[PDB]
Amino acid sequence: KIKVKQPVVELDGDEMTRIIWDKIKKKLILPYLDVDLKYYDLSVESRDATSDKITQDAAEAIKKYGVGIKCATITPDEARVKEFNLHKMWKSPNGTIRNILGGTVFREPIVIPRIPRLVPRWEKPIIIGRHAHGDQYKATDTLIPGPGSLELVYKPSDPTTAQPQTLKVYDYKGSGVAMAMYNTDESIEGFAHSSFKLAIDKKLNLFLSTKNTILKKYDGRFKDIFQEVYEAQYKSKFEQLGIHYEHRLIDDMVAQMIKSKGGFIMALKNYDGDVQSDIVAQGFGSLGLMTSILVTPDGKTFESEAAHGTVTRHYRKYQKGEETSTNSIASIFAWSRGLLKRGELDNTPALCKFANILESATLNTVQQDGIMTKDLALACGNNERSAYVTTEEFLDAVEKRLQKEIKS
Amino acid sequence: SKIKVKQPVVELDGDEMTRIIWDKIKKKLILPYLDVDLKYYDLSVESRDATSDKITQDAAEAIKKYGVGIKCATITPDEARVKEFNLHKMWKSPNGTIRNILGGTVFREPIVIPRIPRLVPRWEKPIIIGRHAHGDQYKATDTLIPGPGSLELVYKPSDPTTAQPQTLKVYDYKGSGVAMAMYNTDESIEGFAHSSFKLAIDKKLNLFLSTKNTILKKYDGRFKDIFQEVYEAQYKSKFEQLGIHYEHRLIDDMVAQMIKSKGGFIMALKNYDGDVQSDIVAQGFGSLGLMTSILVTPDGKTFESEAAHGTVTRHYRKYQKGEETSTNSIASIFAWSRGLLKRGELDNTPALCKFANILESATLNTVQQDGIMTKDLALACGNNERSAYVTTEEFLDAVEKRLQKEI
């Protein structure tokens, strides 16, 4: 058994992804690793009970130990709130964790050669650096009942060092909606730093995307700080490596991305990184083939998460005792990438090496042995029922592939 | 000879290379065949500067006065542009100003030339984006925060009897940063709704509203709620009879699904999303240039047909030196034809609608059948050599030649 030097923070999730999660742990991880798992249950029932405090505790534990691994959770809506006697419509646990940790959520596709790419030219991986902090995800929005004035008001704590601002937003002549959001220079700076370090580390071109021609101050800040940071510590390293940094308007970027062959990093603001993430994932093959990892600017805190959401459809079938074919690759990779970041901080090559053949064994099950879940089988245009295996059958096959590739 | 257009048309001139092809189109493909009174508004950078951007204001009002506006691509100035042009102020995007004054929805769909390869192979049917043309980030107030302090969204109602004042805490800064507020009205969302549903019925297509209502529960919730209310009130029945469906989606689901789809549906989108996604769609179908963009109003009496692909100076700079140029004009031609189509529909002038359809037909056949195309479409087809494409003037000459035949 490989000794993990430091404990790992484990965040458990909901429904089908939770059922899959437990088997990954007990079969693909625990048998091979002596690891101290700090368990935090982020299920809807656990969150509702603790009044969502568990999410905060879990986030703070990741801050303490350095590495967190998270299972897919459900963000409750009106429908689920009514069915599962929920106190309120609890905020996204991912949003809460991201806000506490801050930084950048790096998302890139899990490339399986056999899978058809919906955007054929995309040969090389596209990495998305989604700023994890604020904007829409920490926004204040409200209904405007009728005619009136809307104002943005800033009051400095120290009126001697800074000035007050009362900016005219809008004069309503009827009912409508109003929202305000924010971000800090500290957070945008960390976002930049991580974007530049990954570009250097992975030898790729970096593109920041905003809309600074429309939002001159809010987006211009993203552009200015990035260029500031680039000139501060990264100019030489970029020139020596032969890679380029460039700011573009979100129009050019997304368009040039569709037209490209891939092979570059797109640093995106919280919202854009969220939307484009799925475009990229889907373009490369499927939503279920994408890693997602939160990194802090200091390079010591990590949160590896299962990107794909859990479908209730598969869960009910499972509760009825019917068979399921839910992919577990995203969940498996959540573990492996988390275990990698753990091994690099602790300086444990055995752990690093283990996580690599774990990934290798999972991908080879699909690529080499043709054993896969329904979604991939269909993506390959394999309409036969005998084309795919069950949820359980897939995981068992990966277990045996793990055993095989460990000994060879 | 020369079809008589009853009502005058408002024309907005633009910048750089697009301005040059604009004039070449007008003089060769438009003026020789129509008796049009063109209300001319120069929306170039130098023109807007000199008038302190009031010419953009004038043009928007003219469009509302007459009904149909045809606009050329313009420069939205930035730091570099201010330096190169000696601008007095970094003028707001004219498009934003125009759309704010007129309101409504901008409809965008690819101009499909089957010979041109699709970057998203499965896209066999046009995807139409219905972009909300009103507020949000295109009428927002943003600012810089120098240090620690509070940030509040303050609302004071005009009638303190029907509404309560709102003072909401947005943030307490512990450092320097950025703040911004944006808005939208129910009246504008209702117009967005009506335009979207009407189109879906007109074209017999499924309609999907995308939103981030899981995060912006009140703001984005209002979009979903109004659309749904409008659907049930006067469109649900019609949709069911046609075998089409309206559905509200999360922006995450929709784009992923769109990329996965075979196409052939309308995508109602908020201002920002419409801007971003329409360029993705245009690109996926083959070329960013091959795209129509027309703003409509809920009442059905005002239109703004536009060229939305920008100007891209790299060709204009070659025009300055007297060098050769191969810029695509299909988009700018379609801006005219679509405008005149709306003009013809309004005036009940069948001969104009007929001329506009032939103009489109000729323009497209020049590429599809005869193989005459500009540098950009040639590279899309996958041919690097020079003899693969023609010059800017050559393409327009070819279109004109084919225009004269099909008449």
CSV table of N, CA, C and O in Angstrom, one decimal, chain A residues 247-333:
chain,number,residue,atom,x,y,z
A,247,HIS,N,-4.6,39.5,-25.5
A,247,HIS,CA,-5.9,39.8,-25.1
A,247,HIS,C,-6.8,40.0,-26.4
A,247,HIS,O,-6.4,40.6,-27.4
A,248,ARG,N,-8.0,39.4,-26.4
A,248,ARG,CA,-8.9,39.5,-27.5
A,248,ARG,C,-10.3,39.7,-26.9
A,248,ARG,O,-10.6,39.5,-25.8
A,249,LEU,N,-11.2,40.2,-27.8
A,249,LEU,CA,-12.6,40.4,-27.5
A,249,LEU,C,-13.3,39.0,-27.6
A,249,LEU,O,-12.9,38.2,-28.4
A,250,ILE,N,-14.2,38.8,-26.7
A,250,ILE,CA,-14.9,37.5,-26.6
A,250,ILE,C,-15.5,37.0,-27.9
A,250,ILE,O,-15.7,35.8,-28.1
A,251,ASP,N,-15.7,38.0,-28.8
A,251,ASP,CA,-16.2,37.7,-30.2
A,251,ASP,C,-15.2,36.9,-31.0
A,251,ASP,O,-15.4,35.8,-31.5
A,252,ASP,N,-14.0,37.6,-31.1
A,252,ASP,CA,-12.9,37.0,-31.9
A,252,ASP,C,-12.5,35.7,-31.3
A,252,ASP,O,-12.4,34.7,-32.1
A,253,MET,N,-12.3,35.6,-30.0
A,253,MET,CA,-11.8,34.4,-29.3
A,253,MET,C,-12.7,33.2,-29.7
A,253,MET,O,-12.2,32.3,-30.2
A,254,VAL,N,-13.9,33.3,-29.3
A,254,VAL,CA,-14.8,32.1,-29.5
A,254,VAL,C,-14.9,31.7,-30.9
A,254,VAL,O,-15.1,30.5,-31.2
A,255,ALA,N,-14.9,32.7,-31.8
A,255,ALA,CA,-14.9,32.4,-33.3
A,255,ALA,C,-13.6,31.7,-33.7
A,255,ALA,O,-13.7,30.7,-34.5
A,256,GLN,N,-12.5,32.3,-33.3
A,256,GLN,CA,-11.2,31.7,-33.7
A,256,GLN,C,-11.0,30.4,-33.1
A,256,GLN,O,-10.3,29.5,-33.6
A,257,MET,N,-11.6,30.1,-31.9
A,257,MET,CA,-11.6,28.8,-31.2
A,257,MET,C,-12.3,27.8,-32.1
A,257,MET,O,-11.7,26.7,-32.3
A,258,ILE,N,-13.5,28.1,-32.6
A,258,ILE,CA,-14.3,27.2,-33.4
A,258,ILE,C,-13.5,26.8,-34.7
A,258,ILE,O,-13.6,25.6,-35.1
A,259,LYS,N,-12.8,27.7,-35.2
A,259,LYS,CA,-12.0,27.6,-36.5
A,259,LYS,C,-10.7,27.0,-36.3
A,259,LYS,O,-10.1,26.5,-37.2
A,260,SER,N,-10.2,26.9,-35.0
A,260,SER,CA,-8.8,26.5,-34.7
A,260,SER,C,-8.7,25.0,-34.7
A,260,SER,O,-9.6,24.2,-34.9
A,261,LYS,N,-7.4,24.5,-34.6
A,261,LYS,CA,-7.0,23.1,-34.4
A,261,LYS,C,-6.9,22.8,-33.0
A,261,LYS,O,-6.5,21.7,-32.6
A,262,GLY,N,-7.2,23.7,-32.1
A,262,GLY,CA,-7.0,23.6,-30.7
A,262,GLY,C,-5.5,23.8,-30.3
A,262,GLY,O,-4.8,24.3,-31.1
A,263,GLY,N,-5.2,23.5,-29.0
A,263,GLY,CA,-3.8,23.6,-28.6
A,263,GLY,C,-3.4,25.0,-28.0
A,263,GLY,O,-2.5,25.6,-28.4
A,264,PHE,N,-4.2,25.4,-27.0
A,264,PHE,CA,-4.0,26.7,-26.4
A,264,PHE,C,-4.9,26.9,-25.1
A,264,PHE,O,-5.8,26.2,-24.9
A,265,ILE,N,-4.5,27.9,-24.3
A,265,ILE,CA,-5.2,28.1,-23.0
A,265,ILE,C,-6.1,29.4,-23.2
A,265,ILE,O,-5.6,30.4,-23.7
A,266,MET,N,-7.4,29.3,-22.9
A,266,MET,CA,-8.3,30.4,-22.9
A,266,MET,C,-8.6,30.8,-21.4
A,266,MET,O,-9.4,30.2,-20.8
A,267,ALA,N,-8.0,31.9,-21.0
A,267,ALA,CA,-8.4,32.5,-19.7
A,267,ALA,C,-9.7,33.2,-19.8
A,267,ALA,O,-9.8,34.2,-20.7
A,268,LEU,N,-10.7,32.9,-19.1
A,268,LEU,CA,-12.0,33.5,-19.2
A,268,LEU,C,-12.5,33.9,-17.8
A,268,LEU,O,-12.3,33.3,-16.8
A,269,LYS,N,-13.3,35.0,-17.9
A,269,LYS,CA,-14.0,35.4,-16.7
A,269,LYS,C,-15.1,34.4,-16.2
A,269,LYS,O,-15.6,33.7,-17.0
A,270,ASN,N,-15.3,34.3,-14.9
A,270,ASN,CA,-16.2,33.4,-14.3
A,270,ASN,C,-17.4,32.8,-15.2
A,270,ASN,O,-17.5,31.6,-15.4
A,271,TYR,N,-18.2,33.8,-15.7
A,271,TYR,CA,-19.3,33.4,-16.5
A,271,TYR,C,-19.0,32.8,-17.8
A,271,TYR,O,-19.6,31.7,-18.2
A,272,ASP,N,-18.1,33.4,-18.6
A,272,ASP,CA,-17.6,32.9,-19.9
A,272,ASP,C,-17.0,31.5,-19.7
A,272,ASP,O,-17.3,30.6,-20.5
A,273,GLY,N,-16.1,31.4,-18.8
A,273,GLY,CA,-15.5,30.1,-18.5
A,273,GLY,C,-16.5,29.0,-18.2
A,273,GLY,O,-16.2,27.8,-18.5
A,274,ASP,N,-17.6,29.3,-17.6
A,274,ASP,CA,-18.6,28.4,-17.3
A,274,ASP,C,-19.3,27.9,-18.6
A,274,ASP,O,-19.5,26.7,-18.8
A,275,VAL,N,-19.8,28.9,-19.4
A,275,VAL,CA,-20.5,28.6,-20.6
A,275,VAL,C,-19.6,27.9,-21.7
A,275,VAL,O,-20.0,26.9,-22.2
A,276,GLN,N,-18.5,28.5,-21.9
A,276,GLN,CA,-17.5,28.0,-23.0
A,276,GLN,C,-17.0,26.6,-22.6
A,276,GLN,O,-16.6,25.8,-23.5
A,277,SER,N,-16.9,26.3,-21.3
A,277,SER,CA,-16.4,25.1,-20.8
A,277,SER,C,-17.1,23.9,-21.4
A,277,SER,O,-16.5,22.9,-21.8
A,278,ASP,N,-18.5,24.0,-21.4
A,278,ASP,CA,-19.3,23.0,-22.0
A,278,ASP,C,-19.3,22.9,-23.5
A,278,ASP,O,-19.3,21.8,-24.1
A,279,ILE,N,-19.1,24.1,-24.2
A,279,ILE,CA,-18.9,24.1,-25.6
A,279,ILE,C,-17.7,23.3,-26.0
A,279,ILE,O,-17.8,22.4,-26.8
A,280,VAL,N,-16.6,23.6,-25.3
A,280,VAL,CA,-15.3,22.9,-25.5
A,280,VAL,C,-15.5,21.4,-25.3
A,280,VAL,O,-15.2,20.6,-26.1
A,281,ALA,N,-15.9,21.1,-24.1
A,281,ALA,CA,-16.1,19.7,-23.7
A,281,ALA,C,-16.9,18.9,-24.7
A,281,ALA,O,-16.5,17.9,-25.2
A,282,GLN,N,-18.1,19.5,-25.0
A,282,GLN,CA,-19.0,18.9,-26.0
A,282,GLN,C,-18.4,18.8,-27.4
A,282,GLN,O,-18.5,17.8,-28.1
A,283,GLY,N,-17.6,19.8,-27.8
A,283,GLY,CA,-16.9,19.9,-29.0
A,283,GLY,C,-15.8,18.8,-29.2
A,283,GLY,O,-15.7,18.2,-30.3
A,284,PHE,N,-15.2,18.5,-28.1
A,284,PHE,CA,-14.1,17.4,-28.1
A,284,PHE,C,-14.7,16.0,-28.1
A,284,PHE,O,-13.9,15.1,-28.5
A,285,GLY,N,-15.9,15.8,-27.7
A,285,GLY,CA,-16.5,14.5,-27.7
A,285,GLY,C,-17.8,14.4,-26.9
A,285,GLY,O,-18.8,13.9,-27.4
A,286,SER,N,-17.7,14.7,-25.6
A,286,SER,CA,-18.8,14.6,-24.6
A,286,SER,C,-18.6,15.4,-23.4
A,286,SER,O,-17.4,15.6,-23.0
A,287,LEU,N,-19.7,15.8,-22.7
A,287,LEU,CA,-19.6,16.5,-21.5
A,287,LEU,C,-19.0,15.7,-20.3
A,287,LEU,O,-18.4,16.3,-19.4
A,288,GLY,N,-19.2,14.4,-20.4
A,288,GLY,CA,-18.6,13.5,-19.4
A,288,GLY,C,-17.1,13.3,-19.5
A,288,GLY,O,-16.6,12.5,-18.7
A,289,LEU,N,-16.5,13.9,-20.5
A,289,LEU,CA,-15.0,13.8,-20.6
A,289,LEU,C,-14.4,15.1,-20.5
A,289,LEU,O,-13.9,15.7,-21.4
A,290,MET,N,-14.3,15.6,-19.2
A,290,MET,CA,-13.7,16.9,-18.9
A,290,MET,C,-13.2,16.9,-17.4
A,290,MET,O,-14.0,16.5,-16.5
A,291,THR,N,-12.0,17.3,-17.2
A,291,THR,CA,-11.5,17.5,-15.8
A,291,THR,C,-11.8,18.9,-15.4
A,291,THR,O,-11.9,19.8,-16.3
A,292,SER,N,-11.9,19.1,-14.1
A,292,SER,CA,-12.2,20.4,-13.5
A,292,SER,C,-11.4,20.6,-12.2
A,292,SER,O,-11.6,19.7,-11.3
A,293,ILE,N,-10.5,21.6,-12.2
A,293,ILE,CA,-9.7,21.7,-11.0
A,293,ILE,C,-9.5,23.2,-10.6
A,293,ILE,O,-9.1,24.0,-11.4
A,294,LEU,N,-9.8,23.5,-9.3
A,294,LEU,CA,-9.6,24.8,-8.8
A,294,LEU,C,-8.2,24.9,-8.2
A,294,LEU,O,-7.7,24.0,-7.5
A,295,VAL,N,-7.5,26.0,-8.6
A,295,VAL,CA,-6.1,26.2,-8.1
A,295,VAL,C,-6.0,27.6,-7.5
A,295,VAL,O,-6.7,28.6,-8.0
A,296,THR,N,-5.3,27.8,-6.4
A,296,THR,CA,-5.1,29.1,-5.8
A,296,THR,C,-3.7,29.6,-6.3
A,296,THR,O,-2.8,28.9,-6.6
A,297,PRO,N,-3.7,31.0,-6.4
A,297,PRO,CA,-2.5,31.6,-7.0
A,297,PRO,C,-1.1,31.2,-6.3
A,297,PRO,O,-0.1,31.2,-7.0
A,298,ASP,N,-1.2,30.9,-5.0
A,298,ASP,CA,0.0,30.6,-4.2
A,298,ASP,C,0.6,29.2,-4.6
A,298,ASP,O,1.7,28.9,-4.2
A,299,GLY,N,-0.2,28.4,-5.3
A,299,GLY,CA,0.2,27.1,-5.7
A,299,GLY,C,0.2,26.0,-4.7
A,299,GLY,O,0.9,25.0,-4.8
A,300,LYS,N,-0.6,26.2,-3.6
A,300,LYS,CA,-0.6,25.2,-2.5
A,300,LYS,C,-2.0,24.7,-2.2
A,300,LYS,O,-2.1,23.7,-1.4
A,301,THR,N,-3.0,25.2,-2.8
A,301,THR,CA,-4.4,24.7,-2.6
A,301,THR,C,-5.1,24.3,-3.9
A,301,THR,O,-5.0,25.0,-4.9
A,302,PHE,N,-5.7,23.1,-3.8
A,302,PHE,CA,-6.3,22.5,-5.0
A,302,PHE,C,-7.7,21.9,-4.6
A,302,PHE,O,-7.9,21.3,-3.6
A,303,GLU,N,-8.6,22.0,-5.6
A,303,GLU,CA,-9.9,21.3,-5.5
A,303,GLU,C,-10.2,20.7,-6.8
A,303,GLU,O,-10.6,21.3,-7.8
A,304,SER,N,-10.1,19.3,-6.8
A,304,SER,CA,-10.5,18.5,-8.0
A,304,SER,C,-11.9,18.1,-7.9
A,304,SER,O,-12.3,17.5,-6.9
A,305,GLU,N,-12.7,18.4,-8.9
A,305,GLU,CA,-14.1,18.1,-8.8
A,305,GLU,C,-14.6,17.3,-10.1
A,305,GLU,O,-14.0,17.4,-11.2
A,306,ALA,N,-15.7,16.6,-9.9
A,306,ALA,CA,-16.4,15.9,-11.0
A,306,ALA,C,-17.2,17.0,-11.7
A,306,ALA,O,-18.2,17.5,-11.2
A,307,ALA,N,-16.9,17.3,-13.0
A,307,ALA,CA,-17.5,18.3,-13.8
A,307,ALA,C,-19.0,18.0,-14.1
A,307,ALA,O,-19.9,18.8,-13.8
A,308,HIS,N,-19.2,16.8,-14.7
A,308,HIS,CA,-20.6,16.4,-15.1
A,308,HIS,C,-21.6,16.4,-13.9
A,308,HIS,O,-21.2,15.9,-12.8
A,309,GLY,N,-22.8,16.8,-14.1
A,309,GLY,CA,-23.8,16.8,-13.1
A,309,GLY,C,-24.5,15.4,-13.1
A,309,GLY,O,-24.4,14.6,-14.0
A,310,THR,N,-25.1,15.1,-12.0
A,310,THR,CA,-25.8,13.8,-11.8
A,310,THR,C,-27.2,13.8,-12.3
A,310,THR,O,-28.0,14.7,-11.9
A,311,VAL,N,-27.6,12.9,-13.2
A,311,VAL,CA,-28.9,12.8,-13.8
A,311,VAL,C,-29.8,12.0,-12.9
A,311,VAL,O,-29.4,10.9,-12.5
A,312,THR,N,-30.9,12.6,-12.4
A,312,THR,CA,-31.9,11.9,-11.6
A,312,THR,C,-32.5,10.7,-12.2
A,312,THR,O,-32.8,9.7,-11.5
A,313,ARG,N,-32.6,10.7,-13.5
A,313,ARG,CA,-33.2,9.6,-14.3
A,313,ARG,C,-32.5,8.3,-14.0
A,313,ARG,O,-33.2,7.3,-13.7
A,314,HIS,N,-31.2,8.3,-14.0
A,314,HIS,CA,-30.4,7.1,-13.7
A,314,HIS,C,-30.6,6.6,-12.2
A,314,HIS,O,-30.5,5.4,-12.0
A,315,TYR,N,-30.7,7.6,-11.3
A,315,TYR,CA,-30.8,7.3,-9.9
A,315,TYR,C,-32.1,6.6,-9.6
A,315,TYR,O,-32.1,5.6,-8.8
A,316,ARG,N,-33.2,7.1,-10.1
A,316,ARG,CA,-34.5,6.5,-9.8
A,316,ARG,C,-34.5,5.0,-10.3
A,316,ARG,O,-35.0,4.1,-9.6
A,317,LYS,N,-34.0,4.8,-11.5
A,317,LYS,CA,-33.8,3.4,-12.1
A,317,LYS,C,-33.1,2.5,-11.1
A,317,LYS,O,-33.4,1.4,-10.8
A,318,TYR,N,-32.0,3.1,-10.5
A,318,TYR,CA,-31.2,2.4,-9.5
A,318,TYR,C,-31.9,2.1,-8.2
A,318,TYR,O,-31.8,1.0,-7.7
A,319,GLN,N,-32.8,3.0,-7.8
A,319,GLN,CA,-33.6,2.8,-6.6
A,319,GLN,C,-34.7,1.7,-6.8
A,319,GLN,O,-35.0,1.0,-5.9
A,320,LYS,N,-35.2,1.6,-8.1
A,320,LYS,CA,-36.2,0.6,-8.4
A,320,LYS,C,-35.5,-0.7,-8.7
A,320,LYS,O,-36.2,-1.7,-8.9
A,321,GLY,N,-34.2,-0.8,-8.6
A,321,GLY,CA,-33.4,-2.0,-8.8
A,321,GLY,C,-33.2,-2.3,-10.3
A,321,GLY,O,-32.7,-3.4,-10.6
A,322,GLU,N,-33.5,-1.4,-11.1
A,322,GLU,CA,-33.2,-1.5,-12.6
A,322,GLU,C,-31.8,-1.2,-12.9
A,322,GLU,O,-31.0,-0.7,-12.1
A,323,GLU,N,-31.3,-1.6,-14.1
A,323,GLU,CA,-29.9,-1.4,-14.5
A,323,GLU,C,-29.6,0.0,-15.0
A,323,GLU,O,-30.5,0.7,-15.5
A,324,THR,N,-28.4,0.4,-14.8
A,324,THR,CA,-27.9,1.7,-15.2
A,324,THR,C,-26.7,1.7,-16.0
A,324,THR,O,-25.9,0.7,-15.9
A,325,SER,N,-26.4,2.7,-16.8
A,325,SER,CA,-25.2,2.8,-17.6
A,325,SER,C,-24.7,4.2,-17.5
A,325,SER,O,-24.6,5.0,-18.5
A,326,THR,N,-24.3,4.6,-16.3
A,326,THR,CA,-23.8,6.0,-16.1
A,326,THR,C,-22.2,6.0,-16.1
A,326,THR,O,-21.6,5.1,-15.4
A,327,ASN,N,-21.6,6.9,-16.9
A,327,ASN,CA,-20.2,7.0,-17.0
A,327,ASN,C,-19.6,7.4,-15.7
A,327,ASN,O,-20.1,8.3,-15.0
A,328,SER,N,-18.4,6.9,-15.4
A,328,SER,CA,-17.7,7.2,-14.1
A,328,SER,C,-16.3,7.8,-14.4
A,328,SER,O,-15.6,8.1,-13.4
A,329,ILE,N,-16.0,8.1,-15.6
A,329,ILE,CA,-14.6,8.6,-16.0
A,329,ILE,C,-14.4,10.0,-15.3
A,329,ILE,O,-13.3,10.2,-14.8
A,330,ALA,N,-15.4,10.9,-15.4
A,330,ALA,CA,-15.2,12.2,-14.8
A,330,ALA,C,-15.0,12.1,-13.3
A,330,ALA,O,-14.2,12.9,-12.7
A,331,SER,N,-15.7,11.2,-12.6
A,331,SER,CA,-15.5,11.0,-11.2
A,331,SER,C,-14.2,10.4,-10.9
A,331,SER,O,-13.5,10.8,-10.0
A,332,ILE,N,-13.8,9.4,-11.7
A,332,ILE,CA,-12.5,8.7,-11.5
A,332,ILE,C,-11.3,9.7,-11.7
A,332,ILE,O,-10.5,9.8,-10.8
A,333,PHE,N,-11.4,10.5,-12.7
A,333,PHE,CA,-10.4,11.5,-13.0
A,333,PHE,C,-10.4,12.6,-11.9
A,333,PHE,O,-9.3,13.2,-11.6
